[PDB]
Structures are given as C-alpha cells and as structure tokens.
Amino acid sequence: DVGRKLIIDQNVFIEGTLPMGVVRPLTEVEMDHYREPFLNPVDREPLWRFPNELPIAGEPANIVALVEEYMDWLHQSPVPKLLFWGTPGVLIPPAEAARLAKSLPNCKAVDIGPGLNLLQEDNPDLIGSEIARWLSTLIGTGFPFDPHYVEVLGERMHYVDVGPRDGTPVLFLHGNPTSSYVWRNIIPHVAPTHRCIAPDLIGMGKSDKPDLGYFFDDHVRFMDAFIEALGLEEVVLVIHDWGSALGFHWAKRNPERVKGIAFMEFIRPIPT
C-alpha cells in the first residue's frame, strides 16, 4: 500500500495533510509540537488507522452503526449544545453545519469565518471566549502546562489539568493528528472559572504508545478508563474531529453525566 507508506514512512499526514487542515500558515515551532509525538515512524499507526476508521458508505459497519446511534441520540437530547464551524470546512460543509444547529435541540451555532478542520488554530479567541460566555449560562506556540500522568489499563496517559478544583470540569478531546496542544489557546479562556482537563489520546501526544492497531475501540477503552481513573462524575464536553466521536459515544452511553457539548468538525457517516 503506497498510501500507507506515505503516512507511515514519509510522514505525509503530519507534513502535508495537517497543514491542509488550517487556513492560516503554521510556524515551524508549532509544527515541531505536532511532529514531536510522531518522530519515530513506528509510532505513526494512529495516523493511518484513524482515516481508515471514518464512516464512509456504510463501512466500517461497527463505526457507522456506532456513529448513527449517537447522532440519533444527539437529535433526541435536551443537553445544551454549542456548534462551531467555518468556511469551507473539511468534515462539515458550512450549509450542513448551520442546518444541524436548526435540527439539534438547544443548539447555539457560531460562525467562525475562515476555517478548515483545526478551527482552534484559525480563531482560538472566538472559540475560547464564546465557550466562556456559554458556560456562564449553565497566539501562543509553547505548551505552558504541568505534565500530569495517570495509569490507564497498564499504560500511562498524559493530560492537562488546570482551573479550580470544584464545579463541573470541562473535558477537552482532540482528534487526529493533534494532541492537547491543539487546545493550548482555548484553555486559558476557560481555566479561570472552570476546571480544564485535556488528555492526550493513547498512542498520541505525551501518552504511552503501546503496540496496538489503534482502532476506534482501542481509544474508547482507554478514554473510558481515563475518565474513571480521574474520578470524573459530571462533565462538560468540548470535542473536535475524532475526539467528537469519543465525546459523543461516551455522552450517548452516559447522558445523565453530560452537562453540555461544544463541538466542531465532528464525525458523521458519509454516504459517498
């Protein structure tokens, strides 16, 4: 497979596909932070498995059914929702995003303007502040955060933990091919009032990277165990890309524990 050779050996997903998910040009110091987890090609299996797990034309059936179920849940749920989107987008066209805010119950839409997939890198000030104005009702290239580590299923996962200890914590779930680094400029707009937790997915960021196939079920197992390892009860979700698949799948299974979902460029079944 030549496609797999480019993603694994030539790192095309990091050096090519990821810059095509941001409208503005990144800097070499920002790209160094996205490169650092995947310096060794043997650590790049998540970069290849994630797009091969996308729900496209009814395959893979296990993902398509899972995503259909939480999309069905989201349309039935009264949980407050906040939907960011940009033009032209990547996973969500601007027309389908605005139509989704109509159909979803209790959903506020936010036009961010210019955006592809990494809307956090194009306009982190609108996203972080509109989240803060939303939680009330209920640029930096470094990573200035203390590394917290918790043992999960025999492996060790890294996460960001800032903000007050009381109240409802806010769980930030990144996607492919990022890490908690993608929330570095959103978190400061929320940390002064609400606890902010931003884990790195297993095999990504600073978390441990075992010899796994890194299917979606692998992330589900590790993210379920992460949330119980931290002792989180009720949470607010801020989810993006494949993190939205984890966030929505966990919210569908534990709807009484979710107080609000802010999402953008999320996972949905694609007919063609």
Biggest sheet record:
8 strands, mixed
CATH class descriptor name: Alpha Beta
* Number of contiguous helices: 10
Please report which band the strand proportion falls in: under 5%, 5-15%, 15-25%, 25-35%, 35-45% or over 45%.
15-25%
CATH topology: Rossmann fold
Radius of gyration from CA coordinates:
17 Å
> What is the helix/strand order?
HHHHHEHEHHEEEEHEHE
Shape-level CATH architecture: 3-Layer(aba) Sandwich
Total strands: the figure is: 8
PDB class: hydrolase
Keywords: haloalkane dehalogenase, HaloTag7, Self-Labeling Protein
Assembly: monomeric
Entry title: X-ray structure of the haloalkane dehalogenase HaloTag7 circular permutated at positions 141-156 (cpHaloTagDelta)
How would you summarize the topology of this molecule?
Layout: H1 2-8, H2 12-17, H3 28-35, H4 45-49, H5 61-76, E1 81-88, H6 94-103, E2 107-115, H7 119-122, H8 124-135, E3 148-152, E4 155-162, E5 170-173, E6 196-199, H9 216-229, E7 235-240, H10 242-253, E8 258-264
Parallel strand pairs: 1-2, 1-8, 5-6, 5-7, 7-8
Antiparallel strand pairs: 3-4, 4-6
Q: Main traits of this protein?
A:
Rossmann fold, monomer, 272 residues, globular, 35% helix
Structure, explained:
There is one protein chain. An eight-stranded mixed beta sheet has the order 2-1-8-7-5-6-4-3, with helices on both faces. The longest helix is centred in the N-terminal third of the chain and has 16 residues, at 61-76. The chain has a single domain (2-264), classed as 3-Layer(aba) Sandwich (Rossmann fold). It is 35% helix and 19% strand. It has ten helices and eight strands. With 272 residues, the protein is an alpha/beta fold. Belongs to the haloalkane dehalogenase family. Type 2 subfamily.
